[PDB]
From a paper:
Triosephosphate isomerase (TIM, EC 5.3.1.1) is a key enzyme in glycolysis and catalyzes the reversible isomerization between dihydroxyacetone phosphate (DHAP) and glyceraldehyde 3-phosphate (GAP). The overall structure of OvTIM is similar to that of other known TIMs in that it contains 12 α-helices, three 310-helices, and eight parallel β-sheets, forming a classical α/β barrel fold. In OvTIM, a specific SAD motif (S157–D159) is located between α7 and β6, inducing the formation of a subsequent 310-helix γ2 (D159–I164), although the corresponding region is not conserved in either vertebrate TIMs.
Author numbering:
A (entry chain A): 5 to 173, 178 to 252
B (entry chain B): 5 to 252
């Protein structure tokens, strides 16, 4: 499985700061076997995609579940493709828990994006009370099932990267991350197919820093990262190189 | 009060379709005393603003309530200003009722946008079951109060346009008459007079955000407390220009 590192800029960006990050990525020494993605705020997606070499993916941080219509404030996968973007992050913990997105909506968006030619980083993860009640697997499997049930065909998994976010984190160890990634992969093996489970990337979306990335990368079922704050700093390059 | 017409493109657009609308706006003949605004999807705000004559306002269809942070998928007013856009639509009925935005959240966003130098079209309106229970004013006043209460000072009303959406009509087979529209606009202006000030009530634009068409716009525009429109589907068509000219 090809190592996959996505930098989620979250609600951070400006012409000035984006220029700095683009120059950092353009001149950086990055392991050629790492797939690298960045996700700027929607306003800046067309410009970042125009300015970055195709070696880098550029992802939206959200999209909706139909190509057009009366949905003020929403953007569709067709618009992403229009501006050269072929990736989207869906179901991020902030969208589920702050902006109130349901499991079903994330699954509907995922199916629609892939149908429109956009690959999906599909995010899952449990909150603190859920982990403490022993429901990590119950919650993660429920979120995964809502995606599985909404896909139009089993080949769509070739266009998904699963991101596990330990929302509950209190600090998640590399052992705790590996434990969930393994459980999710075994779920994929049973509910989809061994072939998909073996090939699908499951990336870790907890706190990823220059200091902990190499230990996390060595876990056998951790295939990369969905990076938060470090994506805005030169440490992102070290994280991109965590598997090398 | 200066007549104000905003076109809400909703989730419709592409680089090439937007260029087509920009050409329509550029070649349109419009009364220079009318304020005209368009609101493209967020991906297209910088390109639309760069390409479209500065005589037209360019608005975001939504934004969030702090300048930056851990809010994946949200954009801030500071980013709007960074790409030259100084307007936003907030509290649109689709965001309230489909995306579940609260009265308080709309008020917090409105305050934050204005704080950043972004003017706000603040949308209000009641649903049918609320209207049939005699709660049109109760609902509209509750929504307005949540905005008022969250403003950092009453001077922020100089940066607000209120849009009344008759959700009870938009979302059903009913049509709101121009008399029904005028009746709500009058009550909202009187709320402004009583709860804010007469000076603010006299100057604030209250635009109608129901079904606005080439066929009904002139009758709606002549209503004394209707100061313009927030246009939906017709904003994507040449009919938008007739609506921009509805008061002349
Ligand atoms: Mg021309
Ligand atoms: Mg109707």
């Amino acid at each position: 499985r090809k190592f996959f590192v996505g930098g989620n800029w979250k609600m951070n960006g400006s012409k000035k700061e984006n220029d700095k990050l683009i120059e950092m990525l353009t001149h950086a020494k990055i392991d050629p076997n790492t797939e690298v993605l960045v996700a700027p705020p929607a306003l800046y997606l067309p410009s970042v995609r125009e300015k970055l070499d195709k070696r880098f993916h550029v992802a939206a941080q959200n999209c909706y579940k139909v190509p057009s219509g009366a949905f003020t404030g929403e953007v569709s996968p067709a618009m992403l493709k229009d501006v050269g973007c072929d990736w989207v992050i869906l179901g991020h913990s902030e969208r589920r828990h702050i902006l109130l997105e349901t499991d079903q909506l994330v699954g509907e968006k995922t199916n629609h994006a892939i149908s429109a030619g956009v690959n999906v980083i599909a995010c899952i993860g449990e909150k603190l009370e859920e982990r403490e009640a022993g429901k990590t697997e119950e919650v993660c499997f429920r979120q995964m099932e809502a995606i599985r049930k909404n896909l139009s065909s089993a080949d769509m998994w070739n266009h998904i990267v699963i991101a596990y976010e330990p929302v509950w984190a209190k600090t998640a160890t590399e052992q705790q991350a590996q434990e969930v990634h393994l459980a999710v992969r075994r779920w994929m093996e049973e509910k989809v197919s061994p072939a998909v489970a073996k090939s699908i990337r499951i990336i870790y979306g907890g706190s990823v820093t220059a200091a902990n990335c190499r230990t996390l990368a060595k876990q056998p079922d951790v295939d990369g990262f969905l990076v938060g704050g470090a994506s805005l700093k030169p440490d992102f390059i070290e994280i991109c190189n965590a598997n090398a």
